[PDB]
């Protein structure tokens, strides 16, 4: 016999690149993600692939806001 | 419900203005009255305000909930804003169509000298 | 006009005593009367619905909305976005004017009429009925129609129970059996 499986795709190296309290330059990618597991907070942008990036220098801060308990990432200007 | 449906309409723009960090000119409109507030970027600090519930403005008017009243409140809020010295604001229609009374208020505020 | 003044100046007081309401706003009001021509045979020939719409236009005196299919159904051979009917909503003046022509003129002219049913209620006091022929109304003529077509009528009311709904309609002398 044989197998009909045997396929996979390359790993995409998603996930958090800069954790809480880390100092980042503007432009720095904070998280790579499929869809917005995290949402952009203050001084953070969301790219077309839902990458969150710093729009300003400062420290990364994770926070849960709203009734749904959504995870936001923001940059505390420092 | 109507109010909840309007809060929904207002959220996108409000969240956006919060992100930009703009001084808002928030308008509220009822069948009988129309209100106006210049709220600071932080969002928990009213700088100036005006309304047809205020007797200073209401005494001069025929009816409080019409275009002509809105025009008056628009002039009122703008003058008080320029007194403190604000000028640059962003209009927040707060879920109401930019039309009729809301438009009238906004037009009057521009003509008065607010920059939007 | 006729039934509107008839409601305000008579029917209000009757129901104020009957059910013993406190406020006048607690009294039931006829919110809207909705028509419906569920033309499901227009999938082959669309002209059937166009002619049906023209008939419904004359009856109500208002432009009909062409309703679409909500989902695809294999049993009836329909796909989503196919026109399979047309409704009309009536509020204010055109509501009463139609309600006038319904009760007095149209209902008696039904072929082999033996009173309308009084069991047709949903639970929240909203009546329904099934008109068999469209020619019962004065606007439509017997000779001019190409094919006979029935239609549905639904009378939405600001009611809570069925007894309050039938009591409201009974005040307008609605043919019951």
């Amino acid at each position: 016999g044989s197998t009909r499986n045997g396929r996979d795709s390359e790993a995409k190296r998603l996930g958090v690149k800069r954790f809480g309290g880390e100092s980042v330059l503007a432009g720095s990618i904070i998280v790579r993600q499929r869809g917005t597991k995290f949402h952009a907070g203050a001084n953070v942008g969301c790219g077309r692939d839902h990458t969150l990036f710093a729009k300003a220098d400062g420290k990364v801060k994770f926070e849960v806001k709203g009734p749904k308990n959504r995870k936001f990432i923001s940059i505390e200007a420092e | 419900d109507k109010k909840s449906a309007r809060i929904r309409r207002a959220t996108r723009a409000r969240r956006k203005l919060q992100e930009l960090g703009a001084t808002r000119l928030v308008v509220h409109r009822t069948p009988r009255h129309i209100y106006a507030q210049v709220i600071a970027p932080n969002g928990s600090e009213v700088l100036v305000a005006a309304s047809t519930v205020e007797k200073a403005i209401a005494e001069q008017l025929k009816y409080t909930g019409n275009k002509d009243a809105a025009a008056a409140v628009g002039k009122a809020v703008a003058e008080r804003a320029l007194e403190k010295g604000i000028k640059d604001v962003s209009f927040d229609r707060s879920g109401f169509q930019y039309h009729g009374r809301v438009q009238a208020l906004a037009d009057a505020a521009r003509e008065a000298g607010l920059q939007f | 006009a006729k039934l509107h003044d008839y409601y305000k100046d008579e029917v209000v007081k009757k129901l104020m005593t009957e059910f013993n309401y406190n406020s006048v706003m607690q009294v039931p009001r006829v919110e809207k009367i909705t028509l419906n021509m569920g033309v499901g045979e227009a999938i082959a020939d669309k002209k059937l619905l166009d002619n049906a719409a023209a008939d419904l236009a004359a009856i109500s005196g208002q432009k009909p909305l062409i309703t679409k299919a909500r989902k695809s159904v294999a049993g009836f051979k329909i796909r989503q976005g196919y026109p399979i009917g047309c409704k009309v909503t009536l509020r204010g003046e055109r509501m009463w004017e139609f309600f006038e022509r319904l009760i007095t003129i149209a209902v008696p002219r039904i072929r082999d009429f033996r009173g309308l049913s009084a069991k047709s209620f949903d639970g929240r006091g909203n009546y329904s009925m099934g008109v068999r022929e469209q020619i019962i109304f004065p606007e439509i003529d017997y000779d001019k129609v190409d094919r006979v077509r029935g239609l549905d009528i639904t009378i939405t009311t600001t009611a809570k129970s069925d007894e309050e709904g039938r009591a409201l309609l009974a005040a307008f002398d609605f043919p019951f059996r």
């Binding site: 016999g1 044989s2 197998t3 499986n5 | - | -």
Partner: protein, 135 residues
């Protein structure tokens, strides 16, 4: 022979069988057969033990089977060497210490003990007779 009517997947990782059981109380009947050992019970073993148990009570009272064989086991044919996971041959329930396997009601304890003794001889796992507690 007990077996899921359908499954999302045909084949399952071997996995492991650590921990103590859930469902350690006599919940339905008055008397239970409880696993003291750890292992796998095949559908055939569950059936063989059921039959012995049922016959012993002469189809009097009621018997619950608390365990269900929902784990598919594959095997490779003879004289095969790789070339993909084997075919599903049978089904098992994973048993941990404390699992109540069977319950019984509407018989004397004396008869229940006998029936469960006959059932236990069909099972690869060490068992113990247990009774319903008030709390």
């Amino acid at each position: 022979m007990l077996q899921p009517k359908r499954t999302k997947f045909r084949k399952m990782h071997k996995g492991r069988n650590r921990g103590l059981a859930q469902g350690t109380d006599v919940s339905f009947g008055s008397f239970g057969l409880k696993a003291v050992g750890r292992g796998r019970l095949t559908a055939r073993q569950i059936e063989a033990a059921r039959r012995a148990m049922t016959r012993a009570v002469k189809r009097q009272g009621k018997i619950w089977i608390r365990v269900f064989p929902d784990k598919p086991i594959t095997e490779k044919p003879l004289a095969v060497r790789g070339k993909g996971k084997g075919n599903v041959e049978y089904w098992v329930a994973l048993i941990q210490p404390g699992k109540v396997l069977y319950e019984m009601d509407g018989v004397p304890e004396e008869l229940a003990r006998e029936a469960f003794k006959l059932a236990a001889a069909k099972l690869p796992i060490k068992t113990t007779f247990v009774t319903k507690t008030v709390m």
